[PDB]
Structure 1
Amino acid sequence: DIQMTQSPAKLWASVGETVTITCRASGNIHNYLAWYQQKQGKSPQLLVYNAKTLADGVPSRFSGSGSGTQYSLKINSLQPEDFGSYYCQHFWSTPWTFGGGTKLMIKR
């Protein structure tokens, strides 16, 4: 089975800062990787699929990249609406596992 190692688990940041979230697969997943956003109290929403393709209505400040086992989500100059949790998931062999998540929290 292929597992996803996501880092960092927690990230404190401020509006306007740029952050990078990474996911490392335990085997080659051939760009079949999605990123989800999950706001507090809400269901997950698909943000990126096929490693780099933005989903419906997703702003250009989000960028997915990577290949093989190594993938990253960059949020350029993050906005008030970007705080929440982020998860990667692969869709190569089943099981289609999630990374452990990143909680993106505002510095207070």
Structure 2
Amino acid sequence: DIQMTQSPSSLSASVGDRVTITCKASQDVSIGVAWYQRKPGDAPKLLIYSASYRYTGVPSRFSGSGSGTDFTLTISSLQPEDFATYYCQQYYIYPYTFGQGTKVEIKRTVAAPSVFIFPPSKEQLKSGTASVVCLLNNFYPREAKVQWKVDNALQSGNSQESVTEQDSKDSTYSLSSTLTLSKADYEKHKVYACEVTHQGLSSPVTKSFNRGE
């Protein structure tokens, strides 16, 4: 099978920059190369066909070039909505193989997270388990640390964090850290808190609550 090697595997660029994604074919495919855009949770969208011909409704900023074994996709002026994984595909030889893809992330101004804390619900507590959630909303860069404390004691191995995909409008990330404890462990302590460290914050930020308030 013909291998389609994309370079780089991922990249970051500011809004308005010229982005260049290259695709290398293991053998000559002339101009039988298509480019696709796959946004998270969405089906791939056709961008370019015949190596250089732009599909209907595709913005002017997207353009393809190249023949034989070397192909390039160019975004003349990167937009916040252009956050996606881009795939090259050879389509004139079976089994019409696709490249690994290139994740395009957007570089933007540093944005501090708005931090929120949530106590376990009364409905959950009757199930013998307790979840304490710490939300870090709309921040840049992606790097952030969330430490948990119960009765002023640092927690380990009982928390899971989840990060959203880069926002298509403001290019920010969101994070949630879930502290899971048994109803017994939750009922034997009072102070619950999460400490947030991020580049956009001069000093760490704390959000907390006292069980039974």
Secondary structure at the residue paired with 1:93? coil
TM-score (norm 1): 0.96
- The answer for the alignment partner of 1:98 in structure 2 is 98
Q: C-alpha separation between the residues in 2 aligned to 1:70 and 1:10? A: 18
1:70 paired residue number: 70
Given that 1:30 and 1:92 are in contact with CA atoms closer than 8 Å, whether structure 2 keeps it comes out as no
Stretches of structure 2 lacking an aligned partner (at least 5 in a row):
108-140, 142-213
CA distance in 2, matches of 1:90, 1:76: 23
C-alpha contact (below 8 Å) 1:10/1:102 kept by paired residues: yes
Task: Give the deviation of 1:90 after TM superposition.
Answer: 0.3
Q: Which residue of 1 aligns with 2:164?
A: none
For residues 88 and 25 of structure 1, the distance between their equivalents in structure 2, rounded to whole angstroms, comes to 10
Letter in 2 for 1:104: V
Q: Deviations over 1:14-60 (max 9, x none)?
A: 11111100001000111010000011111100000010111121111
| Stretches of 4+ aligned residues off by more than 3 angstroms | none
Residue 106 of structure 1: how far off its partner (Å): 1.7
Count of residue pairs the alignment pairs up: 108
Report the alpha carbon displacement of residue 92 of structure 1 after superposing the two structures with TM: 2.2
Query: TM-score with structure 2 length normalisation?
Result: 0.49
What CA RMSD, in Å, does the superposition of the two structures yield over aligned residues? Answer: 0.9
Whichever residue aligns with residue 84 of structure 1, its letter is: A
Partner of 1:15: 15
Mark the structure with the bigger radius of gyration: 2
Which one scores higher on RCO, CA 8 angstroms, separation ≥ 6?
1
Q: Deviations over 1:36-88 (max 9, x none)?
A: 00111111000000101111211111110000111000101111111111000
Helix, strand or coil: the match of 2:81? Answer: helix
Which residue identity does 2:11 align to in structure 1? L
CA distance in 2, matches of 1:81, 1:52: 22
In 2, Cα distance between equivalents of 1:65 and 1:33: 10
SS at match of 1:36: strand
Find the counterpart in structure 2 of residue 89 from structure 1: 89
Contact 1:6–1:99 (Cα < 8 Å) also in 2: yes
2:60 counterpart residue number? 60
**Gap regions ≥5 residues in structure 1:** none
Tell me, what secondary structure is at the counterpart of 1:27? coil
Q: Using the alignment, how far apart are the partners of 2:60 and 2:98 within structure 1?
A: 24
Q: Which residue of 2 aligns with 1:50?
A: 50
Q: Which residue of 2 aligns with 1:34?
A: 34
AA of the residue aligned to 2:92:
W
| Matched position secondary structure for 2:85 | strand
Report sequence identity in percent. 61
State the SS of the aligned residue for 1:35: strand
